[PDB]
């Protein structure tokens, strides 16, 4: 095959992408990966360990922790919540796959507590 090996073979791809929602996705993934507890390191990694159980699929996240991470991100999640929510779920899925024991078809959910 030539270097032009892609006729768009079998593609019905997304011709446009939600920029705000995907920025929220990556920044929330960074928040889950980097926000740390005072009595240790990386709180939500430890809390996400519990999601390998068959019944557990929801990670409960503190909105004030998100604000302590970054105010612009928290404001965007609060203002654009329903728009960005499945993208946050994809961020959690990307974060929790590193436990390596999850079923491939399992859905994961984010749940924001402590809204001021």
Q: Does 18 bind other proteins (CB under 8 A)?
A: yes
Least separation in angstroms between residue 9's CB and other proteins is: 17
The CA distances from residue 97 to 21, 54, 82, 89, 114, in Å, are: 21, 14, 24, 12, 26
Determine if 7 is a binding residue for other proteins (CB under 8 A): no
Options 17, 40, 105, 116; binder of other proteins; rule CB under 8 A: 17
Residues 65-84 that bind other proteins (CB under 8 A): 82-83
Is 13 a binding residue for other proteins by CB under 8 A? The answer is yes
The site that binds other proteins (CB under 8 A) totals a number of residues, namely 9
Of residues 30 and 80, the one with the C-beta less far from other proteins: 80
**What would you report as the CA-atom Rg of the chain, rounded to the nearest whole angstrom?**
17
Q: Please answer whether residues 51 and 59 qualify as being in contact, where contact means their C-beta atoms are separated by less than 8 angstroms.
A: yes
Give the Cα separation of 80 and 20 in Å (integer).
9
What CA–CA distance (Å, rounded) separates 4 from 17? 24
Does 33 sit near other proteins (CB under 8 A)? no
Residues that bind other proteins (CB under 8 A): 12-18, 82-83
């Amino acid at each position: 095959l030539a270097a032009a090996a892609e006729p768009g073979a079998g593609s019905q791809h997304l011709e446009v992408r939600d920029e705000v929602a995907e920025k929220c996705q990556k920044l929330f993934l960074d928040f889950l990966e980097e926000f740390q507890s005072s009595d240790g390191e990386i709180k939500y990694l430890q809390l996400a360990e519990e999601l390998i159980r068959p019944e557990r699929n929801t990670l409960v996240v503190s909105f004030v922790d998100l604000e302590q991470f970054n105010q612009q991100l928290s404001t965007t999640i609060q203002e654009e919540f329903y728009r960005v929510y499945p993208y946050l779920c994809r961020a959690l899925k990307t974060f929790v796959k590193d436990r390596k024991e999850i079923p491939l078809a399992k859905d994961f959910y984010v749940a924001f507590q402590d809204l001021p």
